[PDB]
Structures are given as structure tokens and as C-alpha cells.
Amino acid sequence: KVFGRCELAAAMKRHGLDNYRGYSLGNWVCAAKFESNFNTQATNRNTDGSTDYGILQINSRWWCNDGRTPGSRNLCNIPCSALLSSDITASVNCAKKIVSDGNGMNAWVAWRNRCKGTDVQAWIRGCRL
Ligand SMILES: [Cl-]
Ligand SMILES: [Cl-]
Ligand SMILES: [Cl-]
Ligand SMILES: [Cl-]
Ligand SMILES: [Cl-]
Ligand SMILES: [Cl-]
Ligand SMILES: [Cl-]
Ligand code: NA
Helix, strand or coil: CECCHHHHHHHHHHCCCCCECCECHHHHHHHHHHHHCCECCCEEECCCCCEEECCCCEECCCCCECCCCCCCCCCCCCEHHHHHCCCCHHHHHHHHHHHCCCCHHHHCHHHHHHHCCCCHHHHHCCCCC
8 A cells, every 4th residue: 555644644643653752753754755655565675685564664684574584583473464564553563662672763774864853743744633
């Protein structure tokens, strides 16, 4: 599913991400824009053989099982395919674990490089929330 901006903001708010671990909703929408262009089916293969999945590009080295990342963990206890659903629940529940892990949203390279320190409220401007 390719979300609209406001559609995704609303879905993320309903799933309890607004101000989760102190990160305002616009941070999450900005991260999703630059990780996946709001496409739940986004996948990208990494040099180390791991793969990033879904709207928040969650990596199989640590967070999900894809059966092809040797020596990896599955800390969200989910198949990586769950992260590609039109239903963002699994992605959101796993992102909550990741952002609690100690480096906050710096775990997302696109957030650190493209969202951090910017006017992220712009990403939810105009939306009925
Ligand atoms: Cl947009
Ligand atoms: Cl915001
Ligand atoms: Cl594996
Ligand atoms: Cl594990
Ligand atoms: Cl599995
Ligand atoms: Cl959803
Ligand atoms: Cl933090
Ligand atoms: Na894994």
C-alpha cells in the first residue's frame, strides 16, 4: 500500500506513535517518507546480506526473520514479510522496540540525515488529526 502523508500520520497516531519515547508524529512521518516513500512493500538489500522491510525499512540483521540472514536475531519475533502488510501494526510495534533500544530514532539513517533538526511538524501540517 502507498499511503498518503496525512493518511499515514492518522494511522501512526491511532497506533500510539505520536510522542512515543518523546518523538513527535512529524518525526515518524518524515522517517517513513525518506525510508520507503510511504510504500509498505519497500525492500532493500544491504551489503552484509541483510534486508530492510516496509514503511520504516526495519532490518533482518536484528529485528525480524527472513530465513536468509545468517547469525541474525529476530528481536520483534515476526517474519519480515509481516512488515510489508497494508496494516502497519507489525511495523509500528517493532519500531517501538527499536526506538527504545538506546539510540532513539538515530537507528534510522534517513531520519538522522534528512529529518533530525528540521521542521518535522511540516510533515503533519494541514492534516485532520
Ligand atoms: Cl509527501
Ligand atoms: Cl511534529
Ligand atoms: Cl535468518
Ligand atoms: Cl532472536
Ligand atoms: Cl518467522
Ligand atoms: Cl494500518
Ligand atoms: Cl531519544
Ligand atoms: Na533475522
